Design an enzyme around this catalytic site. Sequence first.
Site, PDB file in Angstrom:
ATOM      1  N   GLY A   6      -0.381   6.904   2.904  1.00 47.61           N
ATOM      2  CA  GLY A   6      -1.796   7.245   2.836  1.00 47.61           C
ATOM      3  C   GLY A   6      -2.182   7.958   1.556  1.00 47.61           C
ATOM      4  O   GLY A   6      -1.323   8.432   0.801  1.00 47.61           O
ATOM      5  N   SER A   7      -3.503   7.991   1.300  1.00 48.85           N
ATOM      6  CA  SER A   7      -4.119   8.657   0.158  1.00 48.85           C
ATOM      7  C   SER A   7      -5.546   9.123   0.495  1.00 48.85           C
ATOM      8  O   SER A   7      -6.185   8.549   1.371  1.00 48.85           O
ATOM      9  CB  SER A   7      -4.082   7.774  -1.092  1.00 48.85           C
ATOM     10  OG  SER A   7      -5.188   6.894  -1.200  1.00 48.85           O
ATOM     11  N   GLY A  32      -4.367  13.718  -1.912  1.00 48.13           N
ATOM     12  CA  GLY A  32      -3.539  13.078  -2.936  1.00 48.13           C
ATOM     13  C   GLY A  32      -2.964  11.768  -2.417  1.00 48.13           C
ATOM     14  O   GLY A  32      -3.633  11.084  -1.634  1.00 48.13           O
ATOM     15  N   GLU A  40       9.524  16.930   5.107  1.00 46.61           N
ATOM     16  CA  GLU A  40      10.310  16.276   6.149  1.00 46.61           C
ATOM     17  C   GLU A  40       9.451  15.166   6.763  1.00 46.61           C
ATOM     18  O   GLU A  40       8.223  15.266   6.742  1.00 46.61           O
ATOM     19  CB  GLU A  40      10.778  17.297   7.207  1.00 46.61           C
ATOM     20  CG  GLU A  40       9.783  17.598   8.329  1.00 46.61           C
ATOM     21  CD  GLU A  40      10.146  18.801   9.176  1.00 46.61           C
ATOM     22  OE1 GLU A  40       9.224  19.580   9.505  1.00 46.61           O
ATOM     23  OE2 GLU A  40      11.349  18.993   9.470  1.00 46.61           O
ATOM     24  N   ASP A  91      -0.079   9.737  13.478  1.00 50.53           N
ATOM     25  CA  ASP A  91      -0.968  10.888  13.458  1.00 50.53           C
ATOM     26  C   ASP A  91      -1.874  10.859  14.721  1.00 50.53           C
ATOM     27  O   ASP A  91      -2.049   9.803  15.345  1.00 50.53           O
ATOM     28  CB  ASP A  91      -1.717  11.061  12.123  1.00 50.53           C
ATOM     29  CG  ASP A  91      -2.814  10.075  11.763  1.00 50.53           C
ATOM     30  OD1 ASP A  91      -3.564   9.661  12.663  1.00 50.53           O
ATOM     31  OD2 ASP A  91      -3.018   9.838  10.560  1.00 50.53           O
ATOM     32  N   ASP A 130      -8.087  23.478   8.056  1.00 49.92           N
ATOM     33  CA  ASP A 130      -8.431  22.066   8.238  1.00 49.92           C
ATOM     34  C   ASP A 130      -7.727  21.473   9.458  1.00 49.92           C
ATOM     35  O   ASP A 130      -7.193  20.367   9.421  1.00 49.92           O
ATOM     36  CB  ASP A 130      -8.220  21.235   6.947  1.00 49.92           C
ATOM     37  CG  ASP A 130      -8.991  19.912   6.918  1.00 49.92           C
ATOM     38  OD1 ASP A 130      -9.961  19.764   7.702  1.00 49.92           O
ATOM     39  OD2 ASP A 130      -8.592  19.014   6.159  1.00 49.92           O
TER      40      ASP A 130
HETATM   41  N1  6SF Z   1      -2.184  11.501   5.682  1.00 49.08           N
HETATM   42  C1  6SF Z   1      -1.361  10.377   5.216  1.00 49.08           C
HETATM   43  C2  6SF Z   1       0.076  10.628   5.746  1.00 49.08           C
HETATM   44  O1  6SF Z   1       0.479  11.948   5.330  1.00 49.08           O
HETATM   45  C3  6SF Z   1       1.726  12.406   5.679  1.00 49.08           C
HETATM   46  C4  6SF Z   1       2.080  13.684   5.260  1.00 49.08           C
HETATM   47  C5  6SF Z   1       3.326  14.194   5.585  1.00 49.08           C
HETATM   48  C6  6SF Z   1       4.212  13.433   6.324  1.00 49.08           C
HETATM   49 CL1  6SF Z   1       5.761  14.087   6.722  1.00 49.08          CL
HETATM   50  C7  6SF Z   1       3.853  12.159   6.741  1.00 49.08           C
HETATM   51 CL2  6SF Z   1       4.943  11.186   7.669  1.00 49.08          CL
HETATM   52  C8  6SF Z   1       2.613  11.640   6.422  1.00 49.08           C
END
Ligand code: 6SF
EC number: 2.7.11.1
Length: 273
Positions: free
Chosen positions: A13-14, A18, A89, A96, A135
């Site tokens: 993702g972005s 970032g 990690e 999500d 957030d």
């Molecule tokens: N929001 C797009 C995905 O962001 C993330 C950030 C941290 C982790 Cl560990 C993962 Cl698996 C995904």
Amino acid sequence: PLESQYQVGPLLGSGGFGSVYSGIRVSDNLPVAIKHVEKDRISDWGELPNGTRVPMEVVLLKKVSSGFSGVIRLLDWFERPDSFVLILERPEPVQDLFDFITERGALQEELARSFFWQVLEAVRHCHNCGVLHRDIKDENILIDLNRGELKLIDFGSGALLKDTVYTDFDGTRVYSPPEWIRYHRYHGRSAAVWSLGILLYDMVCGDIPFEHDEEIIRGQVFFRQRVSSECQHLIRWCLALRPSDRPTFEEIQNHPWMQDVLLPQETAEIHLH
Ligand SMILES: NCCOc1ccc(Cl)c(Cl)c1
């Protein structure tokens, strides 16, 4: 160097935060997430116990990154000429909470109770570590699908926790409290409780309660789904217009709706497996 230490996988993702890539640590095949943050996009800067200039996000992650699995752990970080690179990690399999609710709709109360309890424990850990997330929302919560464990992510809008007023905010507006909308002022803990009320409503209804500033200010909660009286009471309490009328974390966790929570493993066995 970083490039040899990690094997880059696909983009996860972005956005405002970032760009995040799936990855594997080459030494022990450990699953990792590689987050890239452009230097020109970092407004809040801080310093580590030693005194190195790093993004506030790195400071906050180090303050919370220990044994407790309720917050995503920072494994390492690197500075490049135009960016910072964060090694986090990565649970596997993972989803999500936003994607989870989108796919499955409004959650059964037993499931929302387990999930909400874990978010509360994670937020209490942050506050105990002197960190305010700012957030809290479904998109910033990862579900470790095998263990039934939730993890808070994205400390990019966070701050050091203080007892005085905050006059800056760069989190999600639809999760922000009426005092921020009206006065551009809020206190950390009571603003966190308001966002927790938005999140709980989202879990049990499948969508957020307010869209416009006028709705946030009015704070009238309408239930679009069948929700128990105890759950509705807790939501309406977290969503009190006056910050001083909101429950403390202790009062939320002692609420009758919060009793007899499932363990994370029981949660995965009944609802996720
Ligand atoms: N929001 C797009 C995905 O962001 C993330 C950030 C941290 C982790 Cl560990 C993962 Cl698996 C995904």
